[PDB]
Amino acid sequence: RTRTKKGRAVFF
Amino acid sequence: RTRTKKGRAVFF
Amino acid sequence: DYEKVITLIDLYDNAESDTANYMSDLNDAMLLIKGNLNLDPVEVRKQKEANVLFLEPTVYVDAEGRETEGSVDGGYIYKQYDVQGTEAYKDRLNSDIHMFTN
């Protein structure tokens, strides 16, 4: 069962 | 069980 | 000679120090980023020199097995003021100070 995965902001 | 998490405004 | 226009000299002082406050106190522009996300304040320092900005939205999982994406958004915002009306006003003050004193 998958669970809420928090997003990411990346600038490379 | 997750609960309401209040948002944040940040200026870095 | 200027006794009758001191009040306009006051008004022009007040207007220009108002614009000088507007300049001092508000940020010219900022990179607005919305939505549920993780930003590392160490990584934010690359903001000047990065080429690609990648926003990956948080995925919410429902108890019945559904999955759905948060709304990320990102873009520049910049301060603005009514240049037209304030400059037409200050040009009127300057013009009238000169007119009433020949």
Q: How far apart are CA C102 and CA C89, in angstroms?
A: 20
Look at residues C7, C3, C15, C5 and name the one whose alpha carbon lies nearest to residue C99: C5
Q: Which residues of B touch C44 (CB under 8 A)?
A: 12
Cα–Cα nearest to C8, from C85, C89, C102: C89
Element (H, E) at C30: strand C29-34
- CB crowding C64-100: b at 16 or more within 10 Å, else e: eeeeeebebeeeeeeeeeeeeeeeeeeeebeeebeee
Integer angstrom CA distances of residue B11 from C20, C27, C30, C48? 23, 11, 9, 15
Angle C30-C40-C27 (CA atoms, 0-180°, nearest 5)?
A: 15
Residues 6+ apart with CB under 8 A from C6: none
Task: Record the resolution, in angstroms.
Answer: 3.5
Distance in angstroms (rounded) separating the CA atoms of residues C16 and C91: 12
Q: Report the chain C residue with the minimal C-alpha distance to residue A10.
A: C54
C38, C47, C65: residue with CB nearest A11? C47
List the single residue in C with minimal CA-CA distance to B5.
Answer: C36
Q: How many CB atoms lie within 10 A of CB C42?
A: 7
This entry's atomic model was obtained through: cryo-EM
